[PDB]
């Protein structure tokens, strides 16, 4: 059936980009409460990092993006940590709830939340990830 | 129009120490109130416009702040130029009305 | 490709002079001098975004208007394929949009930010003033943020209680949403979530219809810049109202535009959606339903003057399995054929669904829907030609071959095409077994009627007669270019781009630059 | 500096009409700031009588129902308050002033004028 892991993949990217986004305009503005700027900034590094390496599919042949084994080979190093999906939603969501203190990350937590609640379904429906060997 | 309120009708206080007249309006003003000294013979002067700032010319002893519906004037050191009526105006809405009036005596 | 090029550049000119000029409007006049001290440069910088997102909102829907564009096609061939690139400027256009949204939305994000810190005391005295504006009777504010919240719970403050906050955070959720469901992943493995998914653009223009109906952001009136001179006045913000060269400055917001740009296409769209069901309603009756084996059904069907060219597909919806969707499947069968047919395979919910209606394990009612895609009507213009199909990619070859057959029975002489080779890439014949058959049966037309050199096929295993592995493509069009010198040889392939990238090299490398020479035409779907 | 006088009947009688004139010197009514009549009643009780502006309209408090009405005079510099029916509630120190401040803040005051009304 549908493989919700691959939309929740591709909304957590885009989420932790623009929580990178939302951390560098904090930042670089000097608004108030900056910190939680450097924590969104740093938070959302970690997200894009982590979900860039998308898993395989358990039928059909995958699509990787650009230089996706190298981070695919580090996300593998941690094991059930990443392979688990709902580990992957509980962490998401904790890295997203801090970032919902400012208006200029509040976008990349509720989208974070999201891209959450789309890994706990995948999990719920059994799903895991597996690397992508070449 | 919004009824302000000075609690303190009288105070008393001696040299050189902090006195604190406090008023309270009816309804939330947007911290406009504005502070007025009258002499005993009757000489009305500003002290404090828009609750916080200080009217150019009046000793930088009167200090007020405020937020909302509570707001206070605080004065560091008290001489004998200070025995005077306070009054705590607001401008947020017309009418303009005062407050009660707070006579302070030196101890 | 000087049509699409065009179009690009002058959508890109039409938004770079959008945003320009929608920033000079906002940052130059003195009609916004107050504003631009409140919130500075960050100004124009949201607003200009806003035109260009009102221009490319109107360019997202047109493109993607597929039974307009139907009529258009019937109301009218590098050109008709440039308009088929329609899906393409529907990509760049909504990802430009993403693009202007960011900075309008990273700009209010700066100007939400420095509207609840003057509003707090904690920023310069004169933005600090002009937040007082509004407070009281008889004045507008400046500042938009009301209350005194502190930042940071101040900027959610406004975002949660603002129109425009409100509706910017659920069009960017419904924005982003559509965008990560719209990468190629989705839209080529769970085409279901990515179709559901991007039926958020009705919640995200809804939105955006409304999105400025506060006119929060405020420039001083015209009556008030001729009664308030601000070079005089700008010092002499502590006495403002109180001289008679400097009254309170009333500031005034702009109408909201964005309905003015998108209601045309909103309307256009919906018109779509309404032939849509139109052609729904349209009955086809399903005259004769085989089912091929390894769970493939072709349903031959007739509708109500149904044309169409070879390599079209159509959409094909069952109200019995699914009342919202419409599921594409490609022609198969001749123009001159009295019925058109589809081979659909049972490989999903909906396919499966079709098939227990049809009862091969009365008949469903199915609705048709268009002859779109890219009619390829130029294979029989060149005299010898090079189909190729893997996988499943070959099924309007299929088409294209039947019509050829019809074409030569019916004339034999106004046929350009004169020979056939075609070569099939599977790892095995396990799910188009009635292809093989069209071939065989193909063959034994062409030789029945003593033209048996017409069609020559070979089927290859990537795990005449079948063969095994890859065919060696060098050798292949060196052999064709000795058997065929001094003609067009026409490459039509429907496949993996790999494979494209390939025939195109080996089709520049074997043909002769001069019109003495053999020339090898790639066309890919 | 602007200074501010006020003069007029220290005793007006019940019924009748009370007119005070206040004097400005430092300061033109027509350049600028709002004029108001402030009056503290016995017992320093001030309320914000009513103000003109510069412009020459002028606003009451509705306390006052349509029994006071501010005039002036810009070619003396002067501005006026007009009560018509005085009451016997109307003893009060009447303080002319000037708000230069769009926080409407009076700065300058008048040195009052006890107006006594009796039979
Ligand atoms: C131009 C074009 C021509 C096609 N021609 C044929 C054909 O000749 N024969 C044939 O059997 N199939 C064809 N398809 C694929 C066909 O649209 C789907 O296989 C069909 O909708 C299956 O639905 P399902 O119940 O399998 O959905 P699911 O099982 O949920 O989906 C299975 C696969 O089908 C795709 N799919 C599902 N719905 C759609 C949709 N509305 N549009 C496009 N893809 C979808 C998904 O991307 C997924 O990878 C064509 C698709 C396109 C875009
Ligand atoms: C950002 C990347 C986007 C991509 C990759 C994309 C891609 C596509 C594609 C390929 C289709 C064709 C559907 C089909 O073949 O059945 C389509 C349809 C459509 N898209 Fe998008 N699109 C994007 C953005 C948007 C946006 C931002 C909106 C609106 C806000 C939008 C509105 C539509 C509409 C209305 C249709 C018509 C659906 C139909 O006719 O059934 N698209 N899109
Ligand atoms: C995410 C947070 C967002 C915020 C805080 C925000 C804020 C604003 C504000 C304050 C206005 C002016 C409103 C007015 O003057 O009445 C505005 C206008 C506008 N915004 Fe947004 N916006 C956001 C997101 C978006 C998005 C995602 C789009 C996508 C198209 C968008 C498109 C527009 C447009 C087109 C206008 C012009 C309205 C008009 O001209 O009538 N905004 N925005
Ligand atoms: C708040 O603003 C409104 C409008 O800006 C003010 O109302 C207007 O006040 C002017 C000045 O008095 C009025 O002009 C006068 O009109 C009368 C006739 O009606 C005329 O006889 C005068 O010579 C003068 O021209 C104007 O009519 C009036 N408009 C309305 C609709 O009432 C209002 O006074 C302001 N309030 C405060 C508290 O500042
Ligand atoms: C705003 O903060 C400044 C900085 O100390 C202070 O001087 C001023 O009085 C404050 N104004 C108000 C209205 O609190
Ligand atoms: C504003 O004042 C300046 C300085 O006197 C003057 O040059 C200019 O013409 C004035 N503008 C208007 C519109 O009155
Ligand atoms: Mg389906």
Redesign the pocket.
């Given at each position: 059936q549908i493989e919700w892991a691959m939309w929740a993949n591709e909304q957590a990217l885009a989420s932790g980009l623009i929580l990178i986004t939302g951390g560098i305009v904090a930042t670089a503005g000097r608004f108030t409460q900056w910190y939680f700027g450097a924590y969104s900034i740093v938070a959302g590094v970690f997200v894009c990092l982590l979900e860039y390496p998308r898993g395989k599919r358990k039928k059909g042949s995958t699509m990787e993006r650009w230089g996706q084994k190298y981070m695919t080979a580090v996300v593998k190093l941690f094991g059930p940590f990443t392979r688990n999906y709902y580990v992957r939603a509980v962490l998401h969501l904790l890295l997203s709830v801090p970032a919902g203190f400012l208006l200029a990350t509040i976008?990349g937590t509720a989208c974070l939340a999201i891209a959450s609640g789309i890994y706990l379904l995948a999990a719920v429906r059994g799903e895991q990830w597996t690397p992508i060997e070449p | 129009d919004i009824q302000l309120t000075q609690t303190t009708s009288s105070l008393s206080a001696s040299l050189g120490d902090r006195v604190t007249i406090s008023c309270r309006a009816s309804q939330d003003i947007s911290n406009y109130l504005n502070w007025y000294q009258q002499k005993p013979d009757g000489t009305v002067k500003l002290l404090i416009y828009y609750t916080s700032k200080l009217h150019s010319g009046v000793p930088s002893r009167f200090t007020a702040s405020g937020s909302g519906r509570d707001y206070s004037l605080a004065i560091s050191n008290l001489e004998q130029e200070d025995i005077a009526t306070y009054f705590c105006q607001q401008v947020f809405s017309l009418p303009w009305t005062f407050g009660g009036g707070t006579k302070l005596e030196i101890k | 490709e000087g049509l699409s090029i065009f179009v690009i550049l002058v959508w890109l000119g039409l938004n770079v002079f959008l945003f320009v000029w929608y920033y000079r409007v906002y940052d130059i006049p003195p009609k916004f001098f107050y504003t631009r001290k409140l919130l500075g440069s960050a100004l124009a910088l949201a607003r200009a975004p806003?035109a260009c997102?009102?221009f490319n909102?109107m360019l997202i829907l047109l493109p993607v208007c597929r039974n307009l564009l139907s009529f258009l096609r019937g109301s009218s061939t590098r050109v008709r394929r440039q308009l088929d690139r329609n899906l393409t400027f529907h990509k760049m256009v909504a990802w430009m949009?993403a693009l202007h949204?960011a900075i309008?939305?990273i700009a209010?994000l700066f100007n939400?930010e420095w509207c609840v810190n003057a509003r707090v005391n904690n920023s310069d005295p004169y933005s600090v003033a002009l937040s007082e504006l509004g407070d009281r009777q008889n004045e507008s504010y400046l500042n938009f943020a009301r209350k005194r919240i502190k930042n940071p719970e101040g900027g959610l403050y406004l975002?949660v209680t603002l129109l425009?906050?409100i509706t910017?955070?659920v069009?960017?959720l419904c924005?982003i949403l559509i965008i990560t469901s719209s990468t190629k992943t989705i839209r080529r493995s769970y085409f279901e979530v990515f179709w559901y998914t991007h039926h958020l653009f009705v919640i995200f223009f809804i939105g955006?219809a409304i999105?400025?109906?506060?006119?929060?952001?405020r420039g001083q009136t015209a009556e008030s810049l001729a009664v308030h001179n601000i070079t005089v006045c700008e010092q002499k913000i502590s006495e403002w109202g109180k001289i008679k060269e400097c009254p309170i400055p009333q500031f005034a917001?702009?109408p909201?535009?964005?309905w003015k740009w998108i209601v045309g296409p909103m309307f256009l769209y919906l018109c779509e959606r309404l032939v849509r069901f139109w052609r729904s309603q349209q009955k086809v009756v399903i005259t004769k339903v085989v089912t091929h084996p390894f769970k493939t059904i072709e349903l031959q069907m007739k509708k109500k003057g149904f044309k169409m060219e070879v390599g079209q597909y159509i959409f094909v919806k069952c109200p019995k399995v699914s009342k919202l969707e419409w599921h594409p499947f490609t022609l198969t069968s001749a123009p001159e054929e009295d019925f058109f047919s589809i081979h659909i395979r049972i490989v999903g919910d909906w396919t499966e669904g079709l098939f227990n209606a049809c009862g091969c394990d009365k008949l469903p009612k199915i609705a048709v829907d268009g002859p779109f895609g890219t009619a390829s009507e130029d294979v029989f213009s060149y005299e010898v030609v090079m189909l190729v199909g893997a996988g499943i990619g070959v099924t309007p070859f299929a088409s294209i071959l039947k019509s050829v057959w019809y074409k030569y029975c019916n004339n034999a002489t106004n046929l350009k095409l004169k020979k056939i080779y075609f070569y099939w890439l599977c790892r095995d014949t396990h799910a188009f077994e009635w292809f093989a058959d069209l071939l065989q049966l193909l063959e034994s037309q062409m030789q029945e009627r003593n033209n048996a050199g017409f069609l020559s096929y070979n089927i290859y295993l990537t795990g005449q007669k079948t063969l095994y592995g890859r065919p060696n493509w060098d050798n292949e069009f060196k052999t064709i270019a000795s058997q065929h010198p001094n003609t067009r040889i026409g490459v039509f392939l429907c496949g993996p781009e790999a494979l494209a990238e390939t025939l195109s090299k080996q089709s520049i490398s074997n043909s002769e630059s001069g019109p003495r020479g053999v020339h090898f035409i790639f066309n890919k779907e | 500096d602007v200074q501010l006088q006020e003069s007029g009947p220290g005793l007006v009688k019940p019924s009748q009409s009370l007119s005070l004139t206040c004097s400005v010197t430092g300061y033109s009514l027509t350049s600028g700031s709002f004029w108001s009549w402030i009056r503290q009643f016995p017992g320093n009780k001030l309320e914000w009588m009513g103000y003109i502006t510069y412009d020459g309209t002028s606003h009451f408090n509705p306390s006052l129902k349509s029994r006071f009405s501010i005039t002036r005079d810009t070619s003396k510099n002067q501005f006026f308050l007009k009560l018509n029916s005085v009451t016997t509630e109307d003893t009060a120190t009447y303080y002319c002033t000037r708000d230069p401040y769009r926080y409407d803040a009076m700065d300058f005051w008048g040195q009052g004028t006890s107006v006594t009304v009796s039979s």
């Open positions: 976008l | - | 806003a997102l009102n909102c949009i949204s309008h939305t209010h939400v975002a425009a906050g910017g955070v069009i960017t924005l955006l999105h400025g109906a506060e006119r929060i952001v917001g702009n909201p535009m964005t | -």
